[PDB]
Amino acid sequence: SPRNCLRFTLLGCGSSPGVPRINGDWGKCDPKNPKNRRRRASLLVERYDAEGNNTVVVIDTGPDFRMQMIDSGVHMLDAAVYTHPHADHIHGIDDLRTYVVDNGRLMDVYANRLTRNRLYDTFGYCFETPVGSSYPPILSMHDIAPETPFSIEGAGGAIRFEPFSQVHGDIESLGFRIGSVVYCTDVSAFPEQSLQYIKDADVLIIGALQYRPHPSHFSLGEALEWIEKLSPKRAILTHMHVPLDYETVMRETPHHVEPGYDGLRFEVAV
Amino acid sequence: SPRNCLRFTLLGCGSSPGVPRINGDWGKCDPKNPKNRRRRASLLVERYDAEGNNTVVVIDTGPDFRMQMIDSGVHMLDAAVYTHPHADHIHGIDDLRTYVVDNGRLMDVYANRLTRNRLYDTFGYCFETPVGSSYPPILSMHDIAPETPFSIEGAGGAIRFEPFSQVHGDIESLGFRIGSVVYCTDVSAFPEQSLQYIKDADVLIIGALQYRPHPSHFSLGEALEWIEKLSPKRAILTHMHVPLDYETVMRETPHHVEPGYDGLRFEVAV
Ligand SMILES: Nc1nc2c(ncn2[C@@H]2O[C@H](COP(=O)(O)O)[C@@H](O)[C@H]2O)c(=O)[nH]1
Ligand SMILES: Nc1nc2c(ncn2[C@@H]2O[C@H](COP(=O)(O)O)[C@@H](O)[C@H]2O)c(=O)[nH]1
Ligand SMILES: [K+]
Ligand SMILES: [K+]
Ligand SMILES: [Mn+2]
Ligand SMILES: [Mn+2]
Ligand SMILES: [Mn+2]
Ligand SMILES: [Mn+2]
Ligand code: NA
Ligand code: NA
Ligand code: NA
Ligand code: NA
């Protein structure tokens, strides 16, 4: 059992369609390597105390959320934190309702105004019962914004998040620093004011979509350039699409850089 | 390879939270029997011609849609048909976009007015590009209504659906007859005018949630009463929650009635 630590689980490391795509397309990925089967991008963040009590926070609830949590072996949840309101990050939100029953209280969710206002449009019934329904709401909303730290309380003690702005094509997404672990998915450029949060990480988890340029995400080469500038002790690539085969990318990257895989798990001091 | 037939695949046979729930709760289900692991409710309907060309239609696109299609081994899709606009039936809709690329045309979707109007609210970006986006739409909407047959064309020939009304607690859901296979999920009562569609089926796929009453779904005992009245040659139970263990329900039900399981597949003449 984990003790006196933060524990991170890469619940999903794929691009928006997953790997393979729904049509069975593996791209250039070796279909025989289980690490190439990729769920939609999400991170589990836990804090364990000396007795093994935990605070549990998920970053994003995409379509794979239920299976991600089942496979993680972690059976409770304190909060959900959102990066941005794209389908692959939000469409599993209904599956929070089991925890609301278990906890006896609304699920605390954290989102910027852009994200919150999109969640209210898509999923209003999770916040307020509509005309003609008897389903109670399930979520309690909290604002977050770049450069404003926030803390989530729970049984293992507080987990302090440091949000910051990312450019994501035509919209903004959030990245987060949690201690000296940084999570940067769905990012095509880093604004200058965000750099303080991303430099000198023990572990930088950074999106690298594919080899070729894309308007909304770093290419592998762009992510590697950022890794060189930001000097993380270790980097883990995420949000990886079907052109990026695990073994191939492992060989192509520096020793301290690896492609992620679903279920990748590590502990750090806190 | 299938030939000269309709082929049905029970893509999912669980209740809205799945089995187990996201918190690892199996209820009374034996966790060691793989048939108790249940995805959200969905049916694949195919028609094969003499040469093995197929028309492929899915009923509902819930959160498990991507994995359901991958595991089915069927790598193309002609249309999606919807029963009603609950989370467990619609929140996988974004994953249709791969097929739009493969087919070179918008995905044809079929829904009643209630369902369509909810899809436009939750998922408007799938129909019309919003302000501030460059993502093209992916869906082409078609109306369906009880007691009005409709046909979907494709490579294997047309598949004719006969929709009908079901009471589902405080809303209406659709059931469908396809030849002499009937699909009745998310139903708490059958209106009189729907009975002609549901009687004398070769296979009746009918929702049975749990043993105890529920406002929105038949209990096992209620579904069995309907099966006795409607005299299907075979019945398959679906939308089954955590109280309903596969082996137990198999023993408790008549010979011609079985609990479903994910991946249950059969062929019938057409
Ligand atoms: N919820 C939502 N998802 C969107 C919108 N526009 C595009 N998407 C979906 O968001 C995902 C974008 O993928 P990305 O490449 O940023 O990982 C795709 O699944 C795409 O179809 C939108 O306006 N709202
Ligand atoms: N999309 C949507 N889902 C709903 C609404 N109200 C409840 N739900 C969800 O729909 C499902 C209802 O489950 P059922 O028992 O009918 O299978 C649950 O996942 C529930 O949280 C709503 O207004 N819209
Ligand atoms: K490497
Ligand atoms: K039986
Ligand atoms: Mn994404
Ligand atoms: Mn995105
Ligand atoms: Mn349902
Ligand atoms: Mn329903
Ligand atoms: Na805990
Ligand atoms: Na770019
Ligand atoms: Na076909
Ligand atoms: Na009832």
Q: Which of A259, A236, A113 is nearest to A182 (CA)?
A: A236
Tokens of A224: 């590697």
Breaks (C-N over 2.5 A) in chain A follow: none
Q: Is B63 on the interface with A (CB under 8 A)?
A: yes
Any ligand 1 atom below 6 A from CB of A85: yes
Min Cα–Cα distance to chain A from B221, Å = 25
Question: For A1-270, which CATH superfamily applies?
Answer: Ribonuclease Z/Hydroxyacylglutathione hydrolase-like (3.60.15.10)
Helices B113-122 and A113-122: crossing angle in degrees, nearest 10, is 180
Neighbouring-strand partners of residue B14:
B40, B240
CA distance A142 to A98: 20
Asked whether the beta carbons of A257 and A5 are under 8 A apart, the reply is no
Q: Which of A160, A153, A161 is nearest to A55 (CA)?
A: A153
Q: Is A95 on the interface with B (CB under 8 A)?
A: yes
Q: Give buried/exposed letters for A156-187 (b at 16+ CB in 10 A, else e).
A: beebebbbbbbbbbebbbbbbbbbbbbbbbbb
Q: What is d(CA B93, CA B138) in angstroms, rounded to the nearest whole number? A: 10
| A-chain residues near B73 (CB < 8 A) | 24
Q: Which residues contact A219 (CB under 8 A, 6 or more apart)?
A: A208, A209, A210, A211, A212, A213
Cα–Cα distance measured from residue B253 to residue B255, given in angstroms and rounded to the nearest whole number: 7
The residues, ordered by sequence, that sit 6+ positions from A117 with a Cβ below 8 Å of its Cβ are none
How far off is chain B from A137, nearest CA to CA, in Å? 14
Which residue's CA is minimally distant from atom 20 of ligand 2? B87
User: Which of these, A208, A183, A217, lies nearest to A197 by C-alpha position?
Assistant: A183
Q: Does A22 touch chain B (CB under 8 A)?
A: yes
Q: Do strands B107-111 and B139-143 pair parallel, antiparallel, or not at all (unpaired)?
A: parallel
Amino acid at A91: H
Cβ within 8 Å of residue A7, ≥6 positions away: A44, A45, A46, A47, A48, A265, A266, A267
What 3-state DSSP class applies to B246?
helix
B11, amino acid identity? L
Pairing of strands A5-12, A107-111: unpaired
A91/B94 Cβ within 8 A: yes
Amino acid symbol at A145: A
**Experimental technique of record:** X-ray
Copy the structure tokens of residue B223: 């579904």
User: CA-CA distance, A139 to A161, in Å (whole number)?
Assistant: 20
Tokens 């969640």, located at residue? A119
Amino acid at A59: I
Residues A267, A44: Cα–Cα separation, whole Å: 12
Non-local CB neighbours of A165 within 8 Å, separated by 6+ positions: A146, A147, A172, A174, A175, A191, A193, A194
Q: Is the peptide bond before A213 cis (omega within 30 degrees of 0)?
A: no
Is B104 at the interface with chain A, CB within 8 A? no
Cβ-based neighbours of A124, under 8 Å, separated by 6 or more:
A130, B121
Q: Report the residue numbers after which chain B has a gap, meaning the C atom sits over 2.5 angstroms from the next written residue's N, or none.
A: none
In chain A, where are the structural domains located?
1-270
Inspect the interface and report whether the beta carbons of B24 and A70 lie closer than 8 Å: yes
Contacts of B124 in chain A (CB under 8 A): 121
